[PDB]
Design a protein around this ligand. Sequence first.
Ligand SMILES: [Zn+2]
Lengths: 242, 108, 141, 50, 48, 50, 53, 131, 58, 120
Amino acid sequence: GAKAGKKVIVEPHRHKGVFVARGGKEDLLCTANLVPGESVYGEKRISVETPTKTEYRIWNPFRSKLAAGILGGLETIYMKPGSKVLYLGAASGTSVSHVADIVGPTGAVYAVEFSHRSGRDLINMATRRTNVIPIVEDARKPMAYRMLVPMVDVIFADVAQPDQARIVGINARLFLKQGGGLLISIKASCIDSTAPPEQVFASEVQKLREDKFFPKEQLTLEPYERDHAMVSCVYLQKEFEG
Amino acid sequence: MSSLRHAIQRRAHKERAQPLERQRLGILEKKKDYRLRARDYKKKQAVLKSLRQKAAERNEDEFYFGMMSRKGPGSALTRGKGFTGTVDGDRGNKALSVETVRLLKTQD
Amino acid sequence: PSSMFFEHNEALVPPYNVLVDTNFLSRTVGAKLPLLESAMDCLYASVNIIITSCVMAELEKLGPRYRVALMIARDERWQRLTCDHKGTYADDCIVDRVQKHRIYIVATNDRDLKRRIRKIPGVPIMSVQKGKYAIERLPGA
Amino acid sequence: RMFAKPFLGQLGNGHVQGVYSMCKDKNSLNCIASGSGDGVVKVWDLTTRD
Amino acid sequence: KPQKKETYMQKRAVVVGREERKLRDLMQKLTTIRKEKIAKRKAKKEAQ
Amino acid sequence: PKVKGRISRYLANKCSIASRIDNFSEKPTRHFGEVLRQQLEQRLEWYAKG
Amino acid sequence: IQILGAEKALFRALKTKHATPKYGIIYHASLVGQASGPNKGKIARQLAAKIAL
Amino acid sequence: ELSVRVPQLPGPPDTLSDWYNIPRTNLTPELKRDLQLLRMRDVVAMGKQFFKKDNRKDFVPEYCQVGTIIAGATDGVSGRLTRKERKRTIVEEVLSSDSVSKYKRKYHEIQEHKKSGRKGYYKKLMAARKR
Amino acid sequence: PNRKKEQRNPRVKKRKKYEEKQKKLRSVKAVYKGGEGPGGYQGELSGIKTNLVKSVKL
Amino acid sequence: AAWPKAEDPALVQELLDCVQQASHYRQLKKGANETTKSVNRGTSELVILAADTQPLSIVLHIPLICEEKNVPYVYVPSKVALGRACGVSRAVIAVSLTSNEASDLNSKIRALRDKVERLA
Ligand SMILES: [Zn+2]
């Protein structure tokens, strides 16, 4: 396929911070690498010889639900370079590394994980990248890292818990600005393993509107993950920023 | 109707051809080829009629500014043998100053 | 949308979510038919029956002559989708919600709404027919 | 007279029958209760009117 | 009118090598096949 | 041949075993690797039997 | 001696009828570093000739 | 501690600050051939793999950068081009690839179809009439 | 009038029509069709378009 | 170190019965490396690890990718019983039972993973 050594060109995608790398017989998605020359989880990276220190990392959509959503055609993702992002469910920091690279050096990414060994991997990734800070605590109890997390602009949620809506509800009630963007990744098989997927997504969107967001988009990222859906909402407003 | 005919009713009729003693003259013109010819010739006659109307209703005292920046068709008398009624179009080549020719010739 | 095979809505499974329109609600309490019981007898299946704030607002905008229908509408055991929009126009609220998610069965009786949701694919329509309910475009009943 | 828009909200789904009695908590600030006509009483907190 | 005398620019034009002529022939072939393909696609879509 | 591929796959298996042991211990030990090297030498004698 | 070191750009420009590079290692020499643009080119020629001498 | 300043007072942006400063396209003719290829890649993989028909008026973007895939640490025996195939330009890779005979064959078929009856056929008919 | 063997065997007709109607389904929406292949990620094999959003606007 | 240890009362035996059913249905993968590859490819619907293995680091490395990819993983304390349930005639320590689009085994999987998600 996209063999190592093929020449591609790199154009900027519509979102602020993601690039699309097109070339030859395969077009793929990439983000600007923050630390050059050192891959995180063995991903392919693209080198550009500017007329060195600039390189891009190829984003695996089958492995990261956010990349799956952006190829699925989200209207927006709310995370411009420089915008603080609270990431819930930061298991081993792959997608978190990508989000930190999108946000860049002036912002921050607050990776909240829970399992200790995935926490060790996340500690390694945060020693490498200087704009992500790691927090190993149970996301159901935000009174633990209320001393660490300031008012972020985006909340990513990648937890599959039956209490997913309540988890994002309390974390947004404590750490999200007025009109605060969030993305949630909903897995129907874990939310209600008996129910059909469209009904599960409708139930979760209604639970979020009870928990005071306003849903603006919902897509079923079907050619990359079965029975998933990415739901984009805004906290306590209708527009995103102000 | 359409279910009230047999397949032998629906069977297509074959198209005959030019006789072999006359194949050298070209293809035998049937109805479809004839319609192609009629459309082409009627279109060309339509455009020629519109041009004749224009050349008749030409005002002899018009003045644009392309008339200051082009080389008009003239006549057979002025243009000589190489005279088509069209105005000569700019090929894009031009007259080059001596300095630039020195530079190009140094490169050569 | 997910779970949609050429205008066959695979997503609807018992328990059926059935949306109520004001017209269907008024005419069923007129025709003296228990709402959940008759709907369960019509679909042979468990239903949860939902009523929006727009439908409740139209029943309340109608005068006190519909106090009995208002009480039956506010029967407590039924879910209530609160709406986030302005005009409180129940037809556009129902059609917008159905176009968004497409899981519910619309229960209505007026021919304008009936045609307006027959235009979109894959939504069954329940309507009163003076003896019982009648479901229109559901493949499993 | 342009900006007189007095109506704020409606405390949840309301009752089945009519609201025939109600009373506030003179000690607190957001505790209210309403007793309807069918014989159900409800206690609402005014911060969350859902 | 098609010019007949060779201009100085046409004379001083450089000859082009094997790799570049191969790439030019390849681009000609790919562009032609693209044109015929897009014409057939537009004609079928017009029929539908 | 085939012996090179066979012993190479076998050695890769034993290498991954050593890696997971030495990583997921806290302060690892040596005798598991000694036992594995003994198994490698015994497979070396087994392929010498040929 | 002027275009020592710029051989790749020189021969590509000459075989493509481009404009040849103005200087080579004489750039990172000191004395041409005080000039700017066209005076830098003229100092480059003059320094090449005197270096040959 | 406090020095005299130097007065340095004597269109489209050069670097997109919001995308970490991607340079503007230096439109070399090799880059133009590469961009023709990238708009034309529905024809390159001849029939075996189709792509989403992205066709604008101008196929050059306003911001690009030519790059190369470095390496996958999980795949390095077949997911890595050899030295004799690492070509500098994408179109050089395409010409070094296979099916160039297939392109030539299809091109000859289209050439025959387009020279079907245009003028050589009419010259032939005129000679057969005059003989 | 003449008919086909697909018309002569009523099971095969509802096999051939279903497979054809399954093929049309992949042309409008998308089917999961397995995750990443065993070879690894070889790029989004058929194009990436920038100006296309495909989310259900709530 | 195996904190999602399955308890004695019949949850372990429901797990073993489901594993045997999946082995008959051929929707099952045995072995440490095959579990690792199925989890990496993302076909794994659930994964069970033995807790009485020789040193626990193997069935400790499987939960790392398991937690990275968010699959339900449990520990059953008997590798010989795991082998006798898979039907191997040798001791397995890692079983990843995958997902299809149509069975009743999928319903049994849904019930079982609901129980183990309650366990975690
Ligand atoms: Zn509404």
